Assembly symmetry: C2
Homo-oligomer: 265 residues x 2
């Protein structure tokens, strides 16, 4: 019920921000992509951490919505024909399949810009800086994924692990960090913990994709299923220990529930 | 010499920011696009206005570089095959023709993110807010241009004029505004003046494209060459009067020089 109340608040704000104003297919596409589904783990983490810390709900919801809009945009661009060429996303036709590649490209851009606009509402320069740094890292990570796949190049294990930390880890690092910055607490350790969480999250995604299936450089391909799973499990344990040590009990239980869901796959 | 010193400083900062660090083709592509050419009118306006106002040079150069990186990114995405499908840009092969559509898409995204990162360095929330609002407007303008062309829809003259004000006017509005915000002066009138300047700028671009040539909804197509040119000339006169009235003499002379160049086409 807890998680539901939080998700409903996020859904409502997303619908407000993305309500078309200019009779554009591009607006409709942004709204489509943002509402087709999503477990909303990223905004849920932000909101739950902020509750644990007692951060003002309005600034926290602005962060949570920003992260989700950004996430949405990143999936639109990843799905595009030049990149991953996904016909489907969340069991629904992809943005470009629904609206055209032109409209989908623009929708992705719009969503990123709206994400920055939400962050800017907070009026906290450190959050603006961190979010901007996070965006660029995510981009670097996506570029590495594309290039590692498509270039004839040497790709070390360390390079794959960095690509995970950038492509997936950076946005979780921000989710873990941003509530601490809003509280006026040092966020350096939480940022690293969030990055580890994101790496573990990506690994569990790789493993799900294998089970679901019943070129791309993945950590599972590089080190094997057993080692990859060991790395993910270890990082996840570190995250749980770190979260408990900070006394963040709502967040701890949220992370335990996510872990049980992974375990039940 | 004046304009040259300023442009060289911009070129140098752009090369610093875009110096690759990760051995990525995406990094190389961002640098390629940002350095293939450009008259650098947008950063030159920012730097010149800031000089007239006596604004601290470091914060001003961060704004100027941000605007140019953003501009660069917007041209990469416009050129892409789903949008305008340009084989050339500044007389050089386009980003996607040089590096691939995947790499070009990512380069555009990277440049926008770097632009926001530069803005965030300033530590001024009003600048962050204005820049973010500007980005979204520019996106709306591009969407309108694409959709007006491709949809079977009624497009009024007012809609075309709004599309100009968003697609081209918004970024100039920001260039005119940002130095006033950095000075702690009310920027509302300068923002409107910059928007008018951008509309006139777009119209002169339309007219150049006709002369150069010796579907898309343009103001020239809607109202005709004579009326369009009259609108541009009138807006430009308003801008010159407004700039002189604020005592911004370096900027006034820069704008007169740009106008003479247009006149000599």
């Amino acid at each position: 019920h807890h998680h539901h109340m939080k998700k409903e608040k996020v859904e409502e704000r997303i619908r407000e921000i993305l309500r078309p104003g200019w009779d554009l297919l591009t607006e409709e596409a942004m709204l489509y992509s943002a509402t087709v589904g999503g477990k909303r783990i990223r905004p849920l983490l932000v909101l739950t951490l902020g509750e644990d810390l007692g951060v003002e709900e309005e600034k926290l919801l602005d962060v949570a919505v920003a992260v989700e809009l950004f996430h949405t945009a990143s999936l639109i661009h990843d799905d595009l024909p030049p990149i991953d060429n996904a016909d489907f996303r969340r069991g629904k036709p992809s943005c470009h399949r629904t609206y055209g590649e032109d409209i989908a490209l623009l929708a992705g851009d719009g969503l990123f810009f709206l994400a920055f606009s939400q962050i800017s509402k907070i009026g906290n320069s450190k959050i603006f800086e961190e979010f901007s740094e996070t965006a660029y890292k995510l981009l670097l990570g996506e570029a590495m994924d594309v290039e590692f796949e498509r270039r004839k190049m040497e790709v070390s294990q360390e390079m794959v692990e960095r690509m995970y930390a950038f492509k997936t880890g950076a946005l979780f690092a921000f989710c873990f960090s941003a509530p601490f910055i809003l509280k006026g607490k040092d966020h350096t350790k939480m940022k690293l913990l969030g990055e580890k969480f994101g790496v573990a999250f990506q690994i569990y995604d790789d493993l799900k994709d294998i089970l679901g299936s019943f070129e791309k450089v993945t950590l599972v391909k590089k080190v094997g299923i057993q080692k990859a799973r060991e790395m993910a499990d270890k990082y996840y344990e570190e995250v749980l220990k770190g979260i408990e040590s900070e006394g963040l009990f709502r967040t701890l239980f949220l992370l335990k529930e996510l872990k049980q869901m992974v375990e039940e796959r």
